[PDB]
Amino acid sequence: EVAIGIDLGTTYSCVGICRNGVVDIIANDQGNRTTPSYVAFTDTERLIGDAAKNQASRNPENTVFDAKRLIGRKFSETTVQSDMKHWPFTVKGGSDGKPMIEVSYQGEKKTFHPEEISSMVLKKMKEVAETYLGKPVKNAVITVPAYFNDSQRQATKDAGAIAGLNVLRIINEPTAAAIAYGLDKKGKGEQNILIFDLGGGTFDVSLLTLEDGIFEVKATSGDTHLGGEDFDNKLVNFCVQDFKKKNGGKDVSKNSKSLRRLRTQCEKAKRVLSSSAQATIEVDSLFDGIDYNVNITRAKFEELCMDQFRNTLIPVEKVLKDAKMDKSQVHEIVLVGGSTRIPKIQQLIKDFFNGKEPCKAINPDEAVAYGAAVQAAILSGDQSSA
Ligand SMILES: Nc1ncnc2c1ncn2[C@@H]1O[C@H](COP(=O)(O)OP(N)(=O)O)[C@@H](O)[C@H]1O
Ligand SMILES: COc1ccc(NC(=O)Nc2ccncc2)cc1
Ligand SMILES: COc1ccc(NC(=O)Nc2ccncc2)cc1
Ligand SMILES: [Cl-]
Ligand SMILES: [Cl-]
């Protein structure tokens, strides 16, 4: 009877419930409102979420992430060939052409299809909701990117069925974000909505039209390899060069564990820089037992990422051109994805749209789950949200 909305994200997942017309985004057992889409295998246990991301640098070969980049794809696809450079875990092709993720679990070699890894993330999100509700949860609405094909959607639905969920519907991420803001019920007449979704690994821009409660995806664009991890890498590359200038040319990049530890701290400092003018990147015994410390101003972060931030406007211009419409015709700009919290990105979008304030009242990394939760309640017969 109870239905949840799940954003099964590339890097982070989020679960919400819409009861009595209001939406609660549910915190996990660490108090986090989003959960890493990570699954790790050790000598003793299967870790999911925060626990899996937290030991990634200690167990790189057996820590799986990015299964969303493989779900519903053939191993031979050029996307898989190109993406696999980024993965410390092994991925091979089965006789059926499906990707097989290979890990060691309890001293044994184990293989998993992408939908099996995603089913474990979905199972964790289901359990996060169940702990909060104190009752079992069976029904769910799961979101997918607008460009996902039938194979990708079907495999995501299968991941839900494996997790023990009755998938009421698979819906588009940009549409879920628009539903979260009630833009389907907002007044009347045609409304042109731009969804600017910049997450941990991907960037998606979608131009929607809403006429009479019906959402149509007019045009989409973006970059499948532009997200928060690329901004973290700018801080990593800077710190690697700064360590060289401080420690007689010593190169941290020669040690992959030193890079991973630095990357964890670079991402934390990046988050701090979204609400403070300065942040510290500190790693004790980073490389050769040498302690590392550096202060980064928001201005230096903005400078390192200057081109990447400005280039987010290129897919915005593309969707407007494809939809044959002017930027002045966009009624609402919705900010989605954790990276939209970066002040410079918010300023660039506002300036592009001639001072129009973007819709950001909902925590951007929760807006998709929030909309999916609303849709789950509607599909369960609850008309209180409307
Ligand atoms: N406060 C913050 N400032 C800057 N970046 C932030 C942030 N809070 C979260 N992020 C970034 O958001 C990304 C994850 O975004 P999210 O929307 O949850 O992930 P996803 N799987 O949908 O792509 C990470 O790169 C994270 O560092
Ligand atoms: C209702 O019970 C169900 C039981 C099993 C599945 N699917 C399943 O096992 N699929 C799969 C895909 C790829 N690799 C391994 C497994 C779905 C529903
Ligand atoms: C310095 O400015 C920028 C540089 C690169 C990007 N994106 C990017 O590398 N895209 C990509 C997509 C798919 N495969 C590989 C790469 C964005 C801004
Ligand atoms: Cl419900
Ligand atoms: Cl409760």
Residue numbers in the entry: 33 to 418
Passage from the reporting paper:
233 chemical fragments were screened for binding to the ATPase domain of the Hsp70-x chaperone from the malaria parasite Plasmodium falciparum.
Interestingly, two of these residues (Gln339 and Asn343) in the parasite chaperone differ substantially from those at the same position in the human counterparts (leucine and glycine or serine, respectively), raising the prospect that connecting subsites A and B via this path may also contribute to ligand specificity. In contrast to site 1, site 2 is relatively removed from the ATP-binding cleft; thus, it is less likely that ligand interactions there would affect the catalytic activity of PfHsp70-x. PfHsp70-x residues in contact with the ligand JHJ include Lys130, His145, Glu147, Glu48, Asp190, Ala193 and Ile194, all of which are conserved or conservatively substituted in human erythrocytic chaperones. Thus, all evidence suggests that site 2 is less suitable than site 1 for the design of potent and specific ligands of PfHsp70-x.
